[model samples]
Target chain A: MRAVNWNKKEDDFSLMFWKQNIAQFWTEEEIAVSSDKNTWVQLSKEEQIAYKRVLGGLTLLDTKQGGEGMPLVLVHLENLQAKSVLAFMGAMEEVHAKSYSHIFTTLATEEEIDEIFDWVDTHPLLEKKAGIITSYYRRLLKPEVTKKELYMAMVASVFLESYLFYSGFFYPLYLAGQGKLTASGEIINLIIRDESIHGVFVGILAQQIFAELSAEDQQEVQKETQELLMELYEIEMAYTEEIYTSIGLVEDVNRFVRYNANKGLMNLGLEPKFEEEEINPIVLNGL
Target chain B: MRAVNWNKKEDDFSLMFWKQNIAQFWTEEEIAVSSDKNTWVQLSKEEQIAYKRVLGGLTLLDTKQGGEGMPLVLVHLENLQAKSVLAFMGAMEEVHAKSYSHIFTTLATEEEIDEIFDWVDTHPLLEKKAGIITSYYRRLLKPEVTKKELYMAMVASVFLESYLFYSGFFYPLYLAGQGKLTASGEIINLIIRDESIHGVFVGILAQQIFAELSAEDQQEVQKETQELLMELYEIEMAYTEEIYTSIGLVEDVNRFVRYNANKGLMNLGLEPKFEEEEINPIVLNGL
Candidate 1:
């Protein structure tokens, strides 16, 4: 009810996570991608196309996150320490977005990079996915809002950080698993680690807010979360099916998404939405 | 305009400052203050009262910066990279706020600490200063805001980051310069460095925004900035006189505010607001 006292338990978890996040602070340019030159040439034409499109999609999504979504979440928040950690997470998302361009810089021409960016605009499913996050952020910007809506906003955040990101994540790891573009994979490793913590930390905040809801409110929010997740999963499936045209890869991406969804739920201390065996050992090996 | 292209010059300076800020980050609790325990008891009753009060006031102002002001400036911004830098700065203000509690934790009792926090509520000068900032932020939060309004919001920010906190800063460094409570001084040093960068970086953005204003708008903004600076300087002078009852300190604090105001203007590529000789060399050494 009062302002945060850092010396007290206003936040037991944020300070610890803030230190960990800052300790792992990194710049995308610090890692050398010069070694990936030959790796670019090694990929088939189809893999190269898929790689650029996936990266383009990733960068576009992260741009909204770094610039808009985190600020939307953070601006109205009163807890000083929690804002610190969330802000750090937002900057990490900016870095994640930049690291995509850093990957493109080493591997493609300026014209080619522009084409990939253009492709991000043309991707219908990607646009719809971004639209959902944007809509929630817009709603939160109102002068007055509800706690249920705020909790769901964090749910959307967890959804973005944990689940929606995996389809794009799979390609670089898949490439690295085969010992290709290992450097870009390393960048993805950093980004994945950041997202994992972001989802976990924000989910903790969401859960805190969620526990305060009345039973009816909690049920309403759960129904909303489930329905939205279902719609997002379908959009992601169609998007992945188009992007990952390689045999069996679409199904594998679906499984990866479910695995990460379970991880997200577990972070929320909730039961998994669905159960599935792991499908992407090769990508895990990259990590 | 679509999103930041860091490889190009959509931003010339923010990305650099953002990286440096994150890299230099340190948590408050990790800095050793056990030695300051002796330093605390060694201080005169007067010195301890002023110390806690100054930090208490500083923490209150920064809470507004992190929680309200920067978000008002950032939420509607289309300049993605600059917003990223601004967002990082707001979070650093949260760190600055917590650093005060970190100092209080080592030196003050629980009841004493609560009393100091209550002091934040009753200080008239501090309340007026917070009001000025809050009003500017409120204006900027409107559904439609002019570039002039945005520039003034940045002006308000520049004043807070670069000027108003100096009186509070003086005490910590004053004790440290005397070789007492040197650890708490270290925390202040970190905060001061952060404020310096934040001021410079935001001033650059302000200058850029200012350049985009109409010629009439430029003249209007400048006149307003000078008037507000004078008003704030008087308020700060009265504030120091009220709080710093030690001999010959108020004049030096005034000089320090003038000195930083000039430094702030120079950071904006503008001329100094007032001509004042240097004072407080000991505090300079602490920095």
Candidate 2:
């Protein structure tokens, strides 16, 4: 039953994503993140703290995405090509996670890196966000897990990749727009492209999985998705303020996060959760 | 808990394999398998049957390897870095499986391709081997599965990659040695390199897992591995003869299979299962 013949096309959508993902395949080592050393040293302490913390948060999410999120979605799949795609998607999550470390090593000392990661572990908002998303992923490991649970897991994952990441991404792109840390910014850009695809692909799959539910269960899933997004968004706003207030980018980052949250909802074929929020032109241009 | 921080290195060997595997990352579409069309049609019917069947068998094993084998081993891992490595390895198994379809499409019609896959399903020896290996993989899905069971799953996987694959791999390399279908052989060569690393990496992991067993269980594992090897070798000999006897390469293929079986054992840090067997120089040089 595990035998997959790529010549057979049970799901063309999965095959397409697989090709696109591989075509976009990359590694952290390929980027010259160390080239940002001068830019790093020149940044104000507040800016530097925000930068390291944002990257630390992103690294933790990527780890969950690769290690648990993708696998949970993958275990429920009967479509072999889709299974292959999720496997690649998960692997790239690791690549994305490692790329952040590449940037960290280039800009920070071993002790600084340790301190930042320690901060990540202790951050209350970050801890709450991780707990919320991971509970969904880990729930799928249970013997009595349901299809509805899997759909919720997918929703949680989309939020993690699409909406949850933008706050972390905003500072890097904002810095790049100012021509600072452009090399490391390039790594972020590549990850953005991958996550864009991942969010859309998984969201599409989630929509299809949502259709598999009983009619009443479909409404339940829809409501649950809305609730999950709101819960995560509240946490995201707090996390952003905590990391970005010192640098005075908290408001701009909040808008950017809202903008991406709508995009994330759209990926899942749901209505936008927020009204249009004006994004900073500089960061918009960087993208 | 699912968060993987790449800056931390719990297992250096897994990290090394991850780096090597990424450095060697490739896509089948990048290869000019179609260039082999001229050589493909030039082969005798017997040669073509041997060629397609070899690829078909390899495809089945790759599917099994990617879809079930790696995931089973991965689910038991607490080392996040190793989990990332296996995710990539499993994804590459899909790539390897798809590369065969690339070769098949270049050389065979839709009907011919269907027939080849059909033959793969109906082939008794092929089914037996798939069943034997897959049972180990699926067993890991059981709620009561043990560490010893995981060790056996790893052993089965190494044999699938290192031992079972070599028989199918033999014909492509043999053809390339004769300067026929060299481009398609290029794809096979890439797969061989990936599998070689996979065999060694998983085998090393298996050795570590074996070390964790109770002393009596260690001997049990050793004995069971020997017995499993003999069982697989016997089926492999029959499979090789059925596919290669018409092409008159059965005897040579058997030697290659035994050679790899010994190599596979060595990969697990076990003694060689077979005495030194003279391998065909042509195929030996092709590798």
Candidate 3:
């Protein structure tokens, strides 16, 4: 069967969709800021470093993804549903960038903000990380995509909109839980709500693509997808370890990462690679 | 007077204007290849490096600009004329990227092709150079654009469509003129033709904006725009120097840069700040 025959009335679904997105939106102004600047000033040096790194990482992620997503969507998918979804997603990503700017404007000095953005622009590790993500999407723009390639692309989309972003989202939320960086946390919450909707949208698209595959195509796609997922998992795990260890993340932070990853997998109806007991056994070791 | 009332006839103008863009479009199939393996192996090192860097840079520029322009037009410019112009520009940019890909695919080994693209993704210089160009357009997105800012933004639109892209258009044309890379030259010519039309369309828009501004607003716009253009010119000149020197550009290539820059300034009715006697005197001396 061809793609669903979405008519003008069905396309009106977009008005409701974009309206929901607009309703769910919260700008940086909505986040309440306390007058207590002294508390932030008193943070330990390492904690300060962690804050900057995380925010820098967040900014780079949004900038890179926002830049890449628009063209890929335009080229690959022809449907109005995909067009509307991608446009809204691109707009939301810009909002996320603005949110990061808000945080930086409030928390960091101009020089420090410049340094963070400079690092985002220049850092080799971030470039390497971005390459993996970009290449995955770039593959779709090949003259013809195979069923297997499409499946893999969907998985990559999941990893981007869900797994990788989940870790970054949790970083701020975790800080908020402790009453530090509360404003950033509120922005993250709004971002998460939007991303959650995005995740579900992509998840449904993935399922539709999966269901449409032929038996032979499905088998090949499954085998290739599992291998690809394993490879991506290993690469991301290494990247996570590098980021966490370099920053000397607290035990609670590590717990949050595992927790978020597992929750993401569950949300996508995928099995977690490791049991919670196996992964979280030494969670308090740093503490 | 208010903005010139664009009628349905204007839509015809818009459509015919962009039709040239669509006609000039090409893909990878246009590349010419030699049957002799020895011919493939015989390129000079500088020629090879030049082809590779130019292709990579062009590809990334196309990818980034095409990706960003589509949504920006779709969301921000509700006017049919604006939409039509941007759509054509966006499509032409993709075709430009594919043209570069065709050239790169023919000239470089798979590994080298990958390496060049990886360089594009990771290069700090490219990112830094791109930001200067983008910041001008970004100012238009300021929460509230004043009448002065709006006129300046129109000037920026002219700069991007007319000035910023000319040297890039000439690079392949130069190589093609030498009969060294004829296929790439053909594609660049097509792009140049499209951009020429785009330049005219934006030239009309700029004229329209200028004509509509009140005397005080016009003076304010002229003052702000002069400052902006001077800043932009410096950035472009610096970027051109970096690109040319890094590539060990030929005397003719250097001459082409000046020619293109002069043409762009003339088109915008602005005078070149660095006269031939003052800037790159050796090149001018040789000429």
Who wins the TM-score comparison? Answer: 2
> Candidate 3's residue-wise lDDT over B158-275, tens digit each?
6655666654555555555555455556566666666666666655555656777799887877787667656656655655565566556644454555555555555556666444
Ranking by lDDT: 2, 1, 3
**Per-candidate TM-score against the hidden true structure:** 0.91, 0.94, 0.48
**Candidate 3: deviation at residue B3, Å?**
38
Worst 10 residues of 1 chain A by lDDT: A1-10
lDDT per residue, candidate 1, B237-264, as tens digits? 8998988757457877777878888887
Chain A of candidate 2 compared with the true chain A, TM-score: 0.97
Q: Tens digit of lDDT per residue, candidate 3, span A1-287?
A: 01111122234344455446546744455675443245567767766666666677766666544444443444455343454445556545655665676677667777787777666657665666566666666665443566565655666666666666644555566556666666666677777777766656655556667787899988876676566555555655655565566556544454555555565555456677545743332222211
Reference-based lDDT, each prediction: 0.80, 0.86, 0.55
- Residue A29, candidate 1: Cα error in Å is 4.6
Q: DockQ for model 1?
A: 0.38
**Clashes found in each candidate (C-alpha, N, C closer than 3 A):** 0, 0, 0
DockQ for each model: 0.38, 0.42, 0.02
lDDT of 2 by residue, B1-287 (tens): 33566666777697789889998999887897777888888999999989998888999898888877887678667787888888889888989888888888889898898888888878888889999998888776543567788899999999998999999999999999888999988899999999999999999889888888999999888888999999999999888888998878888999999999998998999888687978789897676
In candidate 2, stretches whose alpha carbon ends up further than 4 angstroms from where it belongs are: A142-146, B142-146
Name the candidate, 1 or 3, with the larger TM-score value.
1
Which rank order by TM-score, best down to worst?
2, 1, 3
Tell me, what's the RMSD of every candidate? 2.7, 2.3, 21.2
How far in Å is the alpha carbon of A107 misplaced in model 1? 1.9
